[PDB]
Design an enzyme around this catalytic site. Structure first.
Site, PDB file in Angstrom:
ATOM      1  N   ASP A 148       0.835  -1.195   0.000  1.00 40.50           N
ATOM      2  CA  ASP A 148       0.000   0.000   0.000  1.00 40.50           C
ATOM      3  C   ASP A 148       0.875   1.253   0.000  1.00 40.50           C
ATOM      4  OD1 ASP A 148      -2.332   1.515  -0.047  1.00 40.50           O
ATOM      5  OD2 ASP A 148      -2.993   0.873   1.989  1.00 40.50           O
TER       6      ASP A 148
ATOM      7  N   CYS B  85      -7.804  -2.103  -5.323  1.00 35.29           N
ATOM      8  CA  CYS B  85      -6.820  -2.225  -4.255  1.00 35.29           C
ATOM      9  C   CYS B  85      -7.572  -2.003  -2.947  1.00 35.29           C
ATOM     10  CB  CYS B  85      -5.676  -1.233  -4.444  1.00 35.29           C
ATOM     11  SG  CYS B  85      -6.203   0.384  -5.059  1.00 35.29           S
TER      12      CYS B  85
ATOM     13  N   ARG C  62      -2.801   1.883  -6.244  1.00 41.13           N
ATOM     14  CA  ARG C  62      -2.301   0.746  -7.016  1.00 41.13           C
ATOM     15  C   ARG C  62      -3.200   0.454  -8.215  1.00 41.13           C
ATOM     16  NH1 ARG C  62      -1.524  -2.712  -1.460  1.00 41.13           N
ATOM     17  NH2 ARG C  62      -3.299  -1.318  -0.996  1.00 41.13           N
ATOM     18  N   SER C  63      -4.520   0.576  -8.045  1.00 43.81           N
ATOM     19  CA  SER C  63      -5.414   0.350  -9.182  1.00 43.81           C
ATOM     20  C   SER C  63      -5.119   1.317 -10.321  1.00 43.81           C
ATOM     21  CB  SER C  63      -6.876   0.467  -8.739  1.00 43.81           C
ATOM     22  OG  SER C  63      -7.175  -0.568  -7.811  1.00 43.81           O
TER      23      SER C  63
ATOM     24  N   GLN D 121      -1.525   7.445  -6.408  1.00 50.35           N
ATOM     25  CA  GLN D 121      -1.577   8.153  -5.144  1.00 50.35           C
ATOM     26  C   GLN D 121      -0.241   8.743  -4.700  1.00 50.35           C
ATOM     27  OE1 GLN D 121      -4.713   9.304  -4.358  1.00 50.35           O
ATOM     28  NE2 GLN D 121      -4.150   8.702  -2.262  1.00 50.35           N
TER      29      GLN D 121
HETATM   30  O1  LIG Z   1      -4.740   0.679  -1.796  1.00 44.83           O
HETATM   31  C1  LIG Z   1      -4.309   1.561  -2.591  1.00 44.83           C
HETATM   32  O2  LIG Z   1      -3.406   1.374  -3.514  1.00 44.83           O
HETATM   33  C2  LIG Z   1      -4.868   2.941  -2.370  1.00 44.83           C
HETATM   34  O3  LIG Z   1      -5.103   3.770  -3.289  1.00 44.83           O
HETATM   35  N1  LIG Z   1      -5.104   3.168  -1.020  1.00 44.83           N
HETATM   36  C3  LIG Z   1      -5.582   4.386  -0.498  1.00 44.83           C
HETATM   37  S1  LIG Z   1      -5.931   5.742  -1.204  1.00 44.83           S
HETATM   38  C4  LIG Z   1      -6.350   6.627   0.029  1.00 44.83           C
HETATM   39  C5  LIG Z   1      -6.226   5.899   1.258  1.00 44.83           C
HETATM   40  C6  LIG Z   1      -5.725   4.468   0.913  1.00 44.83           C
HETATM   41  C7  LIG Z   1      -5.434   3.326   1.947  1.00 44.83           C
HETATM   42  O4  LIG Z   1      -5.243   2.146   1.545  1.00 44.83           O
HETATM   43  O5  LIG Z   1      -5.368   3.588   3.220  1.00 44.83           O
HETATM   44  C8  LIG Z   1      -6.553   6.493   2.578  1.00 44.83           C
HETATM   45  C9  LIG Z   1      -7.249   7.797   2.602  1.00 44.83           C
HETATM   46  N2  LIG Z   1      -6.862   8.653   1.472  1.00 44.83           N
HETATM   47  C10 LIG Z   1      -6.831   8.063   0.163  1.00 44.83           C
HETATM   48 CL   LIG Z   2      -4.666  12.560  -5.838  1.00 44.24          CL
END
Ligand SMILES: O=C(O)C(=O)Nc1sc2c(c1C(=O)O)CCNC2
Ligand SMILES: [Cl-]
Ligand SMILES: [Cl-]
Ligand SMILES: [Cl-]
Ligand SMILES: [Cl-]
Ligand SMILES: [Cl-]
Length: 299
Positions: free
Chosen positions: A182, A216, A222-223, A263
Site C-alpha cells: 500500500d 486495491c 495501485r489500481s 496516489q
Molecule cells: O490501496 C491503494 O493502492 C490505495 O489507493 N489506497 C488508499 S488511497 C487513500 C487511502 C488508501 C489506503 O489504503 O489507506 C486512505 C485515505 N486517502 C486516500
Molecule cells: Cl490525488
C-alpha cells in the site's frame, strides 16, 4: 530511446517527480459525488475522501439502494473499459459480486492484501477453501473456489459465481498481486509486467466480456498504476508507436472517470518504468516476457 524515456531521464536528472505529480493533481478533473456522499451510503464507503463521481459510477441493478463505491473508467481511444472499486467492506461483498454479475465481468484484479500495515484494507470477499463456498444472502449469489495457482508473489484463482435466482454460473478469474505494498510500488517493472501479461493473456479483458474489475484498498492508488500502464501499453500496441503515448495525458483522461488515480509520485515514476519496459515486448521482442518471468522468481 523513446520520447517517454528521454522525458523520464530529464525528470529524474532534475528531481521533479514530486512537482510533475502535483501538477497532475492540480489539473485533475473535479466532478460531484453526491450519491456517494448521501447519509444512507456512509457505511458503503471505505474512505471518506475516496468517492466515485456520479457521472461514471457503477449502478447496482437494485431497487433499494443502487450505490457501490465503483467507477467505470471508459478509455475511448484505447477502446478498453475498467471498473475500479474499493476493496469490498464486510457489508458490501454481496454488492461487489452483484456488480461483477450485472456488468458481466470475467476477471477481478486485486492488487492488495486483506491485511496491510496492521489494518484491514479489504474484506475477505472470496472463499479460501473449495469446500467452504460463500453465499451472499442480500444479493442471492453463490461463490465457490474451484482452484488456485499460487506463485511466489501473486496467485491466480478460478472462481465459480452462481446467480442463485436463475442458476446460471460463470467462471471468474481472480488475479491477486500479493507483494505490492500500500502506497508503494512493485518490487520491479519485471514482476509487475509479468503479472500484467498474465492478466492480458487470460482473456479476461476480451471485449466479448464486461470490463475487468480492478481494485486495491481504495481503488485508486495501485489500481490507477496498474490501469495506467495497461492502457498506455495497449495504446502503444494499437499504434505500434511508442512516441504517440503521452502517459501524463492518459492519466488525466482516466481521472475524468475516478478521482485520485495513482496516489504517490513514485507510483507515477513506476508507471513510466513499466510502460518503457513493456514497450520492448509490444515492439516485437517477445523474449523479454521470458526474461520478466525469470526475473520475477515466481517459483
Ligand atoms: O490501496 C491503494 O493502492 C490505495 O489507493 N489506497 C488508499 S488511497 C487513500 C487511502 C488508501 C489506503 O489504503 O489507506 C486512505 C485515505 N486517502 C486516500
Ligand atoms: Cl490525488
Ligand atoms: Cl440518504
Ligand atoms: Cl490477502
Ligand atoms: Cl500487517
Ligand atoms: Cl474490511
Amino acid at each position: 530511446s523513446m520520447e517517454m524515456e528521454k522525458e523520464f531521464e530529464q525528470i529524474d536528472k532534475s528531481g521533479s517527480w514530486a512537482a510533475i505529480y502535483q501538477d497532475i493533481r492540480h489539473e485533475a478533473s473535479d466532478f460531484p459525488c453526491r450519491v456517494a456522499k448521501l447519509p444512507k451510503n456512509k457505511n458503503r464507503n471505505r474512505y471518506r475522501d475516496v468517492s466515485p463521481f456520479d457521472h461514471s459510477r457503477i449502478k447496482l441493478h437494485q431497487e433499494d439502494n443502487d450505490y457501490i463505491n465503483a467507477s467505470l473508467i471508459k478509455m475511448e481511444e484505447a477502446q478498453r473499459s475498467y471498473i475500479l472499486t474499493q476493496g469490498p467492506l464486510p457489508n458490501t461483498c454481496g454488492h461487489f459480486w452483484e456488480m461483477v454479475w450485472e456488468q458481466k465481468s470475467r476477471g477481478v484484479v486485486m492488487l492488495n492484501r486483506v491485511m496491510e500495515k496492521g489494518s484491514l484494507k479489504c474484506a475477505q470477499y472470496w472463499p479460501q477453501k473449495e469446500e467452504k463456498e460463500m453465499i451472499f444472502e442480500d444479493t442471492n449469489l453463490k461463490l465457490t473456489l474451484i482452484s488456485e495457482d499460487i506463485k511466489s508473489y501473486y496467485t491466480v484463482r478460478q472462481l465459480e459465481l452462481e446467480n442463485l435466482t436463475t442458476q446460471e454460473t460463470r467462471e471468474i478469474l481472480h488475479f491477486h498481486y500479493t507483494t505490492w505494498p500500500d502506497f508503494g510500488v512493485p518490487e520491479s517493472p519485471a514482476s509487475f509486467l509479468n503479472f500484467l501479461f498474465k492478466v492480458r493473456e487470460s482473456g479476461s479483458a476480451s471485449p466479448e466480456h464486461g470490463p475487468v474489475v480492478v481494485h486495491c484498498s481504495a481503488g485508486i492508488g495501485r489500481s490507477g498504476t496498474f490501469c495506467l500502464a495497461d492502457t498506455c501499453l495497449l495504446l502503444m500496441d494499437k499504434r505500434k508507436d511508442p512516441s504517440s503515448v503521452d502517459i501524463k495525458k492518459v492519466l488525466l483522461e482516466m481521472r475524468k472517470f475516478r478521482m485520485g488515480l495513482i496516489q504517490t509520485a513514485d507510483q507515477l515514476r513506476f508507471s513510466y518504468l513499466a510502460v518503457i519496459e513493456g514497450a520492448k515486448f509490444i515492439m516485437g521482442d517477445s523474449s523479454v516476457q521470458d526474461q520478466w518471468k525469470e526475473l520475477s522468481h515466481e517459483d
